[PDB]
Amino acid sequence: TSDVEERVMELITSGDVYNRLAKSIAPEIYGNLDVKKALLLLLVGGVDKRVGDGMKIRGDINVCLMGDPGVAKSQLLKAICKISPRGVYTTGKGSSGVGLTAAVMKDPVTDEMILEGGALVLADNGICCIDEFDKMDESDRTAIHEVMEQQTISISKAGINTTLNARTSILAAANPLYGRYNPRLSPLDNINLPAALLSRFDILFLMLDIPSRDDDEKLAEHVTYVHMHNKQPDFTPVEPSKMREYIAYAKTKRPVMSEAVNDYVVQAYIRLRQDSKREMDSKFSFGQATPRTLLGIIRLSQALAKLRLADMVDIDDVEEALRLVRVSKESLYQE
Amino acid sequence: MFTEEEEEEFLQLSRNPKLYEILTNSIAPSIFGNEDIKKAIVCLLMGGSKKILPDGMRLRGDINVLLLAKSQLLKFVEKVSPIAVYTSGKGAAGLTASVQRFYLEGGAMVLADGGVVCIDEFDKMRDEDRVAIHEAMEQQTISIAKAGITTVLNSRTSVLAAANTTILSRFDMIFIVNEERDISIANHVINIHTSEISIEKMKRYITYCRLKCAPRLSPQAAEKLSSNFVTIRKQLLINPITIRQLEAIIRITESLAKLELSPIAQERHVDEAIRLFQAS
Amino acid sequence: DQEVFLNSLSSDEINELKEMVKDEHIYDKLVRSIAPAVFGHEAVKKGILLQMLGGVHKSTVEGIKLRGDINICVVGDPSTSKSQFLKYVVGFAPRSVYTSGKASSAAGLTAAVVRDEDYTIEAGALMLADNGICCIDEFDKMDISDQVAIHEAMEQQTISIAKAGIHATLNARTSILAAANPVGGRYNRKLSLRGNLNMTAPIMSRFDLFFVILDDCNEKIDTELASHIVDLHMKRDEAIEPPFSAEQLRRYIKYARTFKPILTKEARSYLVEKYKELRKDDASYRITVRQLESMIRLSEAIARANCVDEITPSFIAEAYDLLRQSII
Amino acid sequence: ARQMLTDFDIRNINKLSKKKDIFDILSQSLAPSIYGHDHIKKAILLMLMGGVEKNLENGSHLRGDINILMVGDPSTAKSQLLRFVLNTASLAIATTGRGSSGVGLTAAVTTDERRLEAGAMVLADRGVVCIDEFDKMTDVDRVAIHEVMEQQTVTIAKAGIHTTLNARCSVIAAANPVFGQYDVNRDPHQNIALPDSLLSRFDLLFVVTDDINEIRDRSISEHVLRTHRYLPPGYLEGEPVRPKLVTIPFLRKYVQYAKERVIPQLTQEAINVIVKNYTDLRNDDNTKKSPITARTLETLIRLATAHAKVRLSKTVNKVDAKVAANLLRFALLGED
Amino acid sequence: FSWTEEEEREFRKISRDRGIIDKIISSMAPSIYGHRDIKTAVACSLFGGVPKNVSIRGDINVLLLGDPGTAKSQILKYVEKTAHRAVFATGQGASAVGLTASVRKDEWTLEGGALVLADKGVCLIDEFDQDRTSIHEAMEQQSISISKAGIVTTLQARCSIIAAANPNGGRYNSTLPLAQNVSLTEPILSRFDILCVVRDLVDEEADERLATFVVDSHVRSHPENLQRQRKKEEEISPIPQELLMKYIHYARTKIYPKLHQMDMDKVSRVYADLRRESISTPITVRHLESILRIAESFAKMRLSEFVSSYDLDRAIKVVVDSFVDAQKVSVRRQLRRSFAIYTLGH
Amino acid sequence: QITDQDLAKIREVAAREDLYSLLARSIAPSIYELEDVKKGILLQLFGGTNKTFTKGGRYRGDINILLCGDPSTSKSQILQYVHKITPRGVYTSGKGSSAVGLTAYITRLVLESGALVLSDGGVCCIDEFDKMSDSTRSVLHEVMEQQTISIAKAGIITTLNARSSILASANPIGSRYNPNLPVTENIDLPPPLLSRFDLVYLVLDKVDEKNDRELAKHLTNLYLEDKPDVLPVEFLTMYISYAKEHIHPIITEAAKTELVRAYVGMRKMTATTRQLESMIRLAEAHAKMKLKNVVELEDVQEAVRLIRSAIKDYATDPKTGKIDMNLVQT
DNA sequence: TTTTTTTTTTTTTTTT
Ligand SMILES: Nc1ncnc2c1ncn2[C@@H]1O[C@H](COP(=O)(O)OP(=O)(O)NP(=O)(O)O)[C@@H](O)[C@H]1O
Ligand SMILES: Nc1ncnc2c1ncn2[C@@H]1O[C@H](COP(=O)(O)OP(=O)(O)NP(=O)(O)O)[C@@H](O)[C@H]1O
Ligand SMILES: [Mg+2]
Ligand SMILES: [Mg+2]
Ligand SMILES: [Mg+2]
Ligand SMILES: [Mg+2]
Ligand SMILES: [Mg+2]
């Protein structure tokens, strides 16, 4: 409404909204700016696209944080759960793939069975935070391939034969195999996700807890402040209800592509698949790049074009979208 | 329940200077030899003493023993005790505690209380397996947090075991091991078909001790035991025995004084205690 | 009884039967006539026929019952028409009933405890088809808790209800025709039949005939077989050409069921020797005493197929041969 | 159980808190029947005081509660010392590793239309949970504990039930190493089967061991033999039942007063010692009993806040931080 | 069923040291060849021992293992037709409720199951888990207990049990001990008064001798075939099957045999001897009471109230060799080399 | 219902030389290449002929298809296209289903239809078939082979008519196709079920920059407008529904020589008896699609060629059963 | 104020 616009115009004209918004996600957590700069794109999302030829493609963005223990994976999932207008939390061990997806209840009365939506149904037009995704049983984890790409759900049990509309975004969190990342093994041996599941993530941040005499001093000087005061240490954020009032405006803008940008994202996909062809050398392999990842660049670049409130995507938004996919992997290579 | 017309006989047993051996002679009496074995059954019938300390700590009064036709001793135990239970784990109810449909079951450890449970190939017993006996037999306690069930189950009871690793931790002492016997035994069976004390006295005597006496170590018994336990550890070091065993010695030393109805234990008891323990 | 049936037929129904009873080649024509859509496997076809003719189900002076039924299992590597037999037989025999071994239960196959105005017993397949053919498809996929529901009730006959307070018992005189794949999905020529099929050995021991099928690679067979399959799709039921029509054939089978064949002393004297050969050739697992009784049964059924009141050693040679072939 | 305080008892608690080495008076008065594990009993006292739970205005939670694991040789009072904490915490729930399944340990759905049933960690929601033989849990059970120890809420998504339950307990746990006895000639991650993600949740990891030494074994043996000579005050020789130390009902009153009526704020003077320790503890190369994560910084902040509670202090001072750092370095590195 | 005033006299008349026992053992399921050892037992299990009170069982329980198609299954079905009362319970076909007891409205009540329809006579059962554990409770003293519908009570059984087993989910096997061929706990196996195992030893001239017998029974059983029935009893038993349902009963129910203590010293001398070499590479009072039960049983079998030494020799024979099967491949020859003067060294 | 003007359009279209490619590119316009996958799923919509023998059994045009392949290859999206186009049907997944709910449920005592029985006379689409339990896969054997279900449970002992063509989507045992393992060990379905399908596809994500220059330049091209030759679907579904009931192709004797010769040439090299029964049903579907009442050599050649291409049989080594990745699309 | 299978899906602990 025009009174909402009389608020967000102060933020827009104050400027640099993309970096302010990303820093404002969990000011309680130090650093991880590149990762906040991705989880923010998971709030605005890309564009859902029906084709007049009867096909439809996903607008929800999926993101994976893979990393060492005690790095604020979970502390950060629980923040997006409060910031988003509709998010829900869940965990790997506490969850059946059934109660995560939807379930057939036997005897509520009269011994006749009925269908009840799981956490991914509640996350209708919202978020599901799947915490400790590693410790989920593979028969339970393979239940989400169905929802991460094709949007819908389907069930055929005990006289109930049904679909559920179930449109939702996934924010998973996990630790590598053997509890912490091991440089002796490949990135894939550490990640330990099957390739069709890995394919469904628009980004995999490989975030790591490498010690440093400077960087751990900078961390503790922040964190001790947040115990000495409830405040963040030192910049000023936007409060959640003002953030939602911006993001829910941005989510309306449906930014279309343009030809000189299409021509550029094509070249970037060839270079990524050529790299995947040559760099199957285990110490460097993140698996093979695929058409789901081309759509990953499209969605991540449309999300950036919403946040700047654009009419159409521009090349300045593609060179940034490619950066997040890069920096995710480079967090290992930089060591 | 005892009165003046009955307990003065228990004062007469308590006076006799060969008392302990009179009990060995009257335990599974058909089974020849086996002297230190029958002695252990006695001490398990007598027990040490329960204590509750000023800091809320509790100290276990119950002995446990490991044995290696001797089934007749464990059978005889489910006769002579004030309270007892005989099972290998034939059960098929679990020995310890086990979960069903959810709801609980108390096993033979739970079902025994004061008194005794006795178990014949404790080796081949694996019916709610050895992990559950480590709590049950050491702690007097079985614990469960399964299928929304939460409870503590008491298990305030003695264990006698026979067998044939881990459970040599939990058992306090260890022991092992003619034909004319068989001819007499068969003649007993045939005659169904076609000192000299007994259960009638001995069960009632045991419960009278159990209720009316709970000894303390004299200071001079502590001097003997402390000096002994480090002498054991010095030899063990230069060539394990640990406080888990030292406490067992103490329990034994109490039960050996308890037989006399003596209010205090002395070198007299310590010497048969550490001697019986050296039969490890 | 034969008189009741021969009073039931008309003179013109009998005058058709009269000539096929007269004919010499009749037993080889009957075998050629079963399941006309299936090519080769004459041994199987011959098996099925002898099942429909049954044996003399009989009881000793000792009150024990000696079984007359014949139990056929067809085991095979895939795409070999083991199912086409079952579907032919259900579509032909009197009191037939078909059943998948997967989509079925220990109740639905035997006796079911149910309720109506208190508890009551309902029929499963072995009740809706005594004096008839109980097919069992996919028997290898049957629940192990339920393969044993049949073990109960083939050597010992006698379904025995001891549950839901309704202690009760049923005769269930019935003949099983059971298809299966070998485990892993193709026949492991190198294994025993045990472990080619995972079943309970006692259940396997009291089957009369295991026709193992192999997809024989021979080109002179497959050039014919392919032409046979294309002819069925090209010109349908004009391409099948049996010696007898099904309604002509059932009159013969129903007639033959009314003889009760008898052993010659030659036939006895031959049978003991054919048991010796079988047993010597396992020097144990598939030649128990049950295979003797099966050989009697089969010789009676052949004698019925010939419409003869007495067992000729010729038929025992013919019965023994089916048992030999079953070994592969 | 709950104590009721009075104007007399509150005088005695306040005047006692003035004493120069009060943390040593109280830590010796826990389980005095248990000999010489002095540094374990010090950490238990801080576990009973807890810390300070912070919740930020954006809903972001910060844990307030100590968790302890002690791992060791057989027959070491490692078990016996849990069996004591259970009888001196205000609210305590007992369990063991094999005595547990991860659902019965946390929460389990039940058919009643269906309900969620509270498990052992959802009980004790402001108390303590004691786990013995922790190592005998399967990893399929130990994944249940991972959710609770940092986030302090159980959450379920089974059979159409979806919920969070609060679970703000402290855990104290005990274990054997893989080899029965601790193999001191081998690395800790090879003696201890547990993953770094679980060892990162325990604030203090006490490796405790039997070691044969004449004066040690003597002094212990004398301790227990004195113990086995106790008399309940009204009883007599051979009749069955039925340098200061505080009497434990007073200790429990002290813990209750401190846990209710003081909420320490960090001085920057303490923060400099917390930071100096965290950065050098994590960056020096000497082998630790478990890897030093960014959870360990929080352990220092909580142990110093818990000691300031023992000291009945409105502010955490350099003295508290120095005791917290010495206790943490004893646990993670080795004896001083 | 039962005998009458002429048959009374006939019984003590046909009672003869000329093998009245033997004509009985020969007569168990006459249409099964060989396997006289199993016939020996089934005779004892029919005739039973005598129970004595204070706790001694008279019932003689038996188990039949074997390598299949061996007429263990059918010798049970012969007993249902031969014992006075006896109940046949297919081992897969029963609920544990159906073995035990069940509850229904009339107002509310209880009624009994298969182990309650058994009473001194013989339960017939097969196919060796809570079902199985009910037998583990019933073995000790012949009584169930229940707590259903708040009705805390016993129910008596006091019955013998005949049991058949297929071992191993397959063949029987000589390698390993008998104890291992079946999923049965040793208390079971101690309390069975005999265990028998049957093998397919493929001797060609034994096989010949089945088949002669078998096919002849097929002739004899053909509906082509009242008085010719009298020739068609055909002496396949020496005792008319018609009489055994009387003889059994008249032993059981007129004779309650008793043991001549003068000779019982030999039983004790033997029991020690047997224990000595069993222990040289395990034998119990349950193996002694088996000798004592079966010996009373055989006096029932020669219609005598006063047990005689030949019953003890027959009984010793039945019980001794059954031990020889445990461990068999290693042990047996060693056992035979001692045992041969006892089992059959008459 | 078809009017004289509608029939005139249908008869005009059937006379075109591009027809088989025109229909194939028109069943799913937004999918790039995959021409042999479209060309076989087109034939599944028409199906073969359906035949009753007065005695000797029943046989049917229900072609079963398995899309097996590595992820992000449009297996699940072709499955969406078919489910929208089929005149009746179901879409489901291998985790979403139970054996009961896939077939029929004992309700109240009464029977309720599960997914296949809800979906006779049209395509049943199973996605994620690889993730399905062996118990649920073990129910498919009779209902693919005999077009029917048989039940024997409490009260109900019965058959059901179940004339469903299955379209299955699957993913290999290691989640991306493994060229070190042989093709049968990638697919990892049991042979009695793998043999049940009429067409088996490998779709493979082979990197080829001269191809991916076109795929990305196609796929991103959708995003140039917000709501962005071929037949209109309205007419295409009509042409299929005419040909499904007004055309029934019979086998010419000139087609038999080839059907036999081809089967012998395959079975020499396994090509079990169901390969011939599938060649018949596809060769009927191709003539049916082209509006012919007779099957000919030109049709049997495509029914063969399409089977050789679908499994990449020309790229599979003649021994070992491994595949040479250089030969795949050259 | 008290129970029996048999068919079904989802949860939970128990055994090779
Ligand atoms: N001060 C003490 N120091 C050492 N041991 C003691 C002490 N006081 C009592 N104990 C004794 O030794 C045991 C203490 O060890 P405890 O904690 O119970 O076993 P644990 O170390 O957990 N061993 P375990 O259960 O076998 O792994 C008790 O059983 C007592 O017998
Ligand atoms: N010695 C024998 N004399 C006569 N018939 C025999 C003999 N041994 C076996 N049989 C026959 O072989 C079969 C034995 O069947 P059965 O008694 O059911 O075998 P079983 O092995 O005991 N069966 P089972 O317990 O189910 O495995 C019957 O057909 C008998 O007639
Ligand atoms: Mg976390
Ligand atoms: Mg078939
Ligand atoms: Mg302990
Ligand atoms: Mg038998
Ligand atoms: Mg897909």
Q: Which two tokens stand for residue D23?
A: 């943390």
Question: Nearest CA to E118 among E184, E172, E195, E61?
Answer: E61
- Bases on strand G under 7 Å from any protein CB: 2-16
Q: Which two tokens stand for residue D224?
A: 């227990």
Q: Which two tokens stand for residue E186?
A: 């040793």
Atom of ligand 1 nearest to the CA of B169: 26
Contact C62, C99 (CB under 8 A): no
Determine if ligand 2 sits within 6 Å of the CB of residue C226: no
Option in F153, F259, F272 nearest C230 (CB): F259
Q: What is the resolution of this structure in A?
A: 3.4
Q: Establish whether the CB of F101 is closer than 7 Å to any nucleic acid atom in strand G.
A: yes
- Strand A49-50 relative to strand D153-158, pairing: unpaired
Q: How far apart are CA F289 and CA C274, in angstroms?
A: 61
Burial class (CB in 10 A: 0-12, 13-18, 19+), C103: buried
Report which residue type is found at D123: L
Q: Would residue F320 count as lying in a domain?
A: no
Q: How far apart are CA B101 and CA B99, in angstroms?
A: 7
Per domain, the residue ranges of chain A are: 1-328
Q: How far is A218 from chain F (nearest CA, A)?
A: 42
Q: For residue F218, give the 3-state DSSP assignment.
A: helix
> In chain E, where does DSSP find H-type helix?
5-14, 20-27, 36-47, 72-79, 96-100, 130-138, 178-181, 186-191, 204-220, 228-232, 241-254, 264-279, 285-301, 309-324, 328-343
CA distances in angstroms from F13 to A316, B136, B137, F49, F292, listed in the order given: 48, 85, 88, 22, 13
Number of domains in chain F: 1
Q: Residue A209 CB: number of other CB atoms within 10 A?
A: 18
Residues with Cβ within 8 Å of B12's Cβ and at least 6 positions away in sequence, in order, are: none
**DSSP state, residue D239:** P
Rg (CA), chain A: 21
CA-angle at C171, arms to C165 and C172, nearest 5°: 105
**Contact status of C125 with chain F (Cβ, < 8 Å):** yes
Residues with Cβ within 8 Å of C150's Cβ and at least 6 positions away in sequence, in order, are: C109, C110, C126, C136, C176, C203
Name C89's bridge partners: none
Q: Residue C116 CB: number of other CB atoms within 10 A?
A: 7
Q: How far apart are CA C81 and CA C34, in angstroms?
A: 13
Q: How far apart are CA F128 and CA F137, in angstroms?
A: 12
Q: How far apart are CA F177 and CA F183, in angstroms?
A: 9
Q: How far apart are CA A237 and CA D58, in angstroms?
A: 11
Count the residues in chain A. 335
Q: Establish whether the CB of F93 is closer than 7 Å to any nucleic acid atom in strand G.
A: no
Detail the DSSP E strand segments found in chain D. Answer: 54-55, 61-62, 68-72, 92-96, 107-110, 115-118, 128-132, 153-158, 161-166, 170-175, 204-208, 265-266, 315-316
The DSSP H or E segment spanning F10 is: helix F4-14
Q: Which two tokens stand for residue F22?
A: 């025109």
Number of domains in chain D: 1
Question: Nearest CA to A60 among A174, A171, A197, A164?
Answer: A171
Determine if ligand 2 sits within 6 Å of the CB of residue C155: yes
Q: How does DSSP assign C247-259, residue by residue? A: HHHHHHHHHHTT-
- Say how far F106 CA is from G7 C1', in Å: 7
Q: How far apart are CA E319 and CA E323, in angstroms?
A: 7
Option in D80, D238, D248 nearest B214 (CB): D238
Q: Given an 8 Å threshold on Cβ–Cβ distance, is B135 in contact with D248? A: no
Q: Which two tokens stand for residue E113?
A: 């199951």
Q: Which domain holds residue E180?
A: 1-342
Contact E251, E47 (CB under 8 A): yes
Q: For residue C215, give the 3-state DSSP assignment.
A: coil
Q: Is the dihedral angle over the CA atoms E221, E225, E226, E232 positive or is it negative?
A: negative
Detail the DSSP E strand segments found in chain A. Answer: 49-50, 56-57, 63-67, 88-91, 102-105, 114-117, 126-131, 153-157, 160-164, 168-174, 203-207
- Say how far E70 CA is from G6 C1', in Å: 35
Contact B163, B127 (CB under 8 A): no
Number of domains in chain E: 1
Chain D contacts in chain A segment 79-138 (CB below 8 A): 79, 82, 88-96, 98-100, 102-103, 105, 107-108, 116-119, 122, 131-132, 135
Determine if ligand 1 sits within 6 Å of the CB of residue D76: yes
CA distances in angstroms from E215 to C45, C220, C308, E272, listed in the order given: 27, 43, 19, 48
F107 nearest nucleotide via C1' and CA: G7
Question: Nearest CA to F66 among F200, F196, F172, F183?
Answer: F200
**DSSP state, residue E56:** B
Q: For residue B130, give the 3-state DSSP assignment.
A: coil
Q: For residue D89, give the 3-state DSSP assignment.
A: coil
Burial class (CB in 10 A: 0-12, 13-18, 19+), E245: middle
Number of domains in chain C: 1
Chain A residues in contact with D160 (beta carbon < 8 A):
99, 102-103, 105, 116-118
Q: How far apart are CA B215 and CA D238, in angstroms?
A: 4
Q: Which two tokens stand for residue A327?
A: 């920096």
Q: How far apart are CA B236 and CA F237, in angstroms?
A: 91
Q: How far apart are CA E346 and CA F19, in angstroms?
A: 100
The DSSP H or E segment spanning C36 is: none
CA distances in angstroms from F158 to D218, E65, F98, F151, listed in the order given: 83, 40, 20, 5
Q: How far apart are CA B31 and CA B87, in angstroms?
A: 20
Q: Which domain holds residue D88?
A: 1-336
**DSSP state, residue E303:** T
Residues C152-167: b if buried by 16+ CB within 10 A, e if exposed: bbbbbbbbbbbbbbeb
CA distances in angstroms from C269 to C235, C297, E205, E214, listed in the order given: 51, 16, 15, 12
Q: How far is C316 from chain E (nearest CA, A)?
A: 13
Torsion of CA C21, C22, C28, C34, to 10 degrees: -30
List the subunits that have 3+ CB pairs under 8 angstroms with D. Answer: A, B
CA distances in angstroms from E145 to C203, C219, E88, listed in the order given: 36, 71, 22
Contact E71, E35 (CB under 8 A): yes
Flag whether C269 is marked binding: no
Closest residue, chain D, to B144 (C-alpha): D99
Backbone phi, psi, residue D254, to 5°: -65, -50
- Which residue numbers of B belong to the known binding site for ATP? 69-71
Burial class (CB in 10 A: 0-12, 13-18, 19+), B8: exposed
Tokens 């047997």 label which residue? E274
Torsion of CA C178, C184, C189, C191, to 10 degrees: -90
- What CATH fold (topology level) applies to the domain A1-328? Rossmann fold (3.40.50)
**Contact status of E280 with chain B (Cβ, < 8 Å):** no
- Which residue numbers of F belong to the known binding site? 69-76
Q: Which of residues 134-153 of E touch strand G (CB under 7 A)?
A: 148-150
What CATH number is given to the structural domain containing E211? 3.40.50.300
Q: Which of residues 128-167 of B touch strand G (CB under 7 A)?
A: 128, 146-147
Ligand in closest contact with the CA of B250? 1
Q: For residue F72, give the 3-state DSSP assignment.
A: coil
Chain E contacts in chain C segment 130-169 (CB below 8 A): 148-149, 151-152, 155-156, 158-165, 167
Q: Which domain holds residue F76?
A: 4-310
The DSSP H or E segment spanning B125 is: none
Option in F57, F153, F272 nearest C78 (CB): F272
Q: How does DSSP assign E225-265, residue by residue? A: --THHHHHTTTSSSS-HHHHHHHHHHHHHH---EE-TTTHH
**Contact status of E77 with chain B (Cβ, < 8 Å):** no
Closest CA to ligand 1's atom 29 = B244
Chain breaks in chain B (C to N over 2.5 A) after: 68, 91, 101, 164, 177, 194, 239
Residues with Cβ within 8 Å of A154's Cβ and at least 6 positions away in sequence, in order, are: A146, A162, A163, A164, F91, F92, F93, F96, F127
What CATH number is given to the structural domain containing F261? 3.40.50.300
Contact A217, D280 (CB under 8 A): no
Option in B49, B57, B150 nearest D120 (CB): B150
Closest residue, chain C, to F53 (C-alpha): C237
Determine if ligand 1 sits within 6 Å of the CB of residue B243: yes
Report which residue type is found at A275: D
What CATH number is given to the structural domain containing C16? 3.40.50.300
**DSSP state, residue D51:** -
D103 nearest nucleotide via C1' and CA: G12
Neighbours of ion ligand 4 (CB under 5 A): C 83
Question: Nearest CA to F184 among F173, F170, F196?
Answer: F173
Write a three-state SS string for C79-94. Answer: CCCHHHHHHHHHCCCC
Question: Nearest CA to A179 among A132, A140, A139?
Answer: A132
The DSSP H or E segment spanning F107 is: strand F104-107
Give counts: helices (H), strands (E), chain A: 16, 11
Burial class (CB in 10 A: 0-12, 13-18, 19+), E129: exposed
Chain C residues in contact with F138 (beta carbon < 8 A):
102, 141
CA distances in angstroms from C273 to B105, C206, E70, E207, E218, listed in the order given: 62, 21, 20, 10, 16
Question: Nearest CA to D203 among D13, D103, D69?
Answer: D69
Residues with Cβ within 8 Å of D244's Cβ and at least 6 positions away in sequence, in order, are: D25
Q: Residue D209 CB: number of other CB atoms within 10 A?
A: 13
Q: How many Cα neighbours within 13 Å face the side chain of B87?
A: 20
Contact A268, A322 (CB under 8 A): yes
Torsion of CA E1, E6, E8, E9, to 10 degrees: -150
Mutation for testing the C interface, residue in F273, F278, F280, F300 having most C CBs under 10 Å: F273
Q: How far apart are CA B127 and CA B132, in angstroms?
A: 10
Q: Which of residues 140-179 of D touch strand G (CB under 7 A)?
A: 158-159
Backbone phi, psi, residue D205, to 5°: -125, 90
Contact F222, A51 (CB under 8 A): yes
Burial class (CB in 10 A: 0-12, 13-18, 19+), F13: middle
Q: Given an 8 Å threshold on Cβ–Cβ distance, is F72 in contact with A290? A: yes
Q: How far apart are CA E283 and CA E322, in angstroms?
A: 11
Backbone phi, psi, residue B93, to 5°: -60, 140
Ligand in closest contact with the CA of E166? 2
Residues F258-291: b if buried by 16+ CB within 10 A, e if exposed: bbbebbbebbeeebbbebbbbbbbbbbbbbbbbb
Q: How far apart are CA D78 and CA D76, in angstroms?
A: 5
Q: For residue A33, give the 3-state DSSP assignment.
A: helix
Q: Which domain holds residue C123?
A: 11-328
Q: How far apart are CA A202 and CA A198, in angstroms?
A: 9
Q: Which two tokens stand for residue E23?
A: 């004509």
- Helix axes of E36-47 and E72-79: crossing angle, nearest 10 degrees: 30
Burial class (CB in 10 A: 0-12, 13-18, 19+), E180: middle
Q: Would residue F127 count as lying in a domain?
A: yes
- Strand C168-170 relative to strand C159-161, pairing: antiparallel
Q: Would residue C310 count as lying in a domain?
A: yes
Q: Which two tokens stand for residue F201?
A: 């596809």
Q: Which of residues 95-114 of B touch strand G (CB under 7 A)?
A: 98-99, 102
- What CATH fold (topology level) applies to the domain B1-280? Rossmann fold (3.40.50)
Q: For residue D33, give the 3-state DSSP assignment.
A: coil
Q: For residue E153, give the 3-state DSSP assignment.
A: strand
Q: How far apart are CA D127 and CA D91, in angstroms?
A: 5
Flag whether B touches F (3+ CB pairs, 8 A cutoff).
no
Residues with Cβ within 8 Å of E86's Cβ and at least 6 positions away in sequence, in order, are: E79, E80, E118, E121, E122, E123, E124
| For ligand 2, mutation pick of C155, C293, C294 (most atoms within 8 Å of CB) | C155
Q: Establish whether the CB of F105 is closer than 7 Å to any nucleic acid atom in strand G.
A: yes
Q: Which two tokens stand for residue A185?
A: 């093994």
Contact D277, D325 (CB under 8 A): yes
Q: For residue C64, give the 3-state DSSP assignment.
A: coil
What CATH number is given to the structural domain containing D285? 3.40.50.300
- Rounded to the nearest angstrom, the distance between the alpha carbon of D47 and the centre of ligand 2 is 73
Q: How far apart are CA F165 and CA F22, in angstroms?
A: 23
Burial class (CB in 10 A: 0-12, 13-18, 19+), E252: buried
Q: Name the protein residue, with chain letter, whose CA is nearest the C1' of G6.
A: F154
Name F160's bridge partners: F149
Q: How does DSSP assign F248-310, residue by residue? A: -PEEPHHHHHHHHHHHHHHHT----THHHHHHHHHHHHHHHHTT-SEE-HHHHHHHHHHHHHH
Chain breaks in chain D (C to N over 2.5 A) after: 112, 242
Q: Is the dihedral angle over the CA atoms F135, F140, F146, F149 positive or is it negative?
A: positive
The DSSP H or E segment spanning B25 is: none
Longest dimension (CA), chain B: 64
Q: How far apart are CA C277 and CA C270, in angstroms?
A: 11
- Strand C175-180 relative to strand F165-170, pairing: unpaired
Question: Nearest CA to D107 among E56, B145, A45?
Answer: B145
Tokens 């309604």 label which residue? C247
Q: How far apart are CA D66 and CA A128, in angstroms?
A: 30
Closest CA to ligand 1's atom 10 = D77
Closest residue, chain D, to A110 (C-alpha): D113
Count the residues in chain C. 328
Q: How far is A218 from chain D (nearest CA, A)?
A: 9
A156 nearest nucleotide via C1' and CA: G9
Tokens 């042409």 label which residue? F239
- Strand B58-59 relative to strand B51-52, pairing: antiparallel
Q: How far apart are CA D247 and CA B129, in angstroms?
A: 41
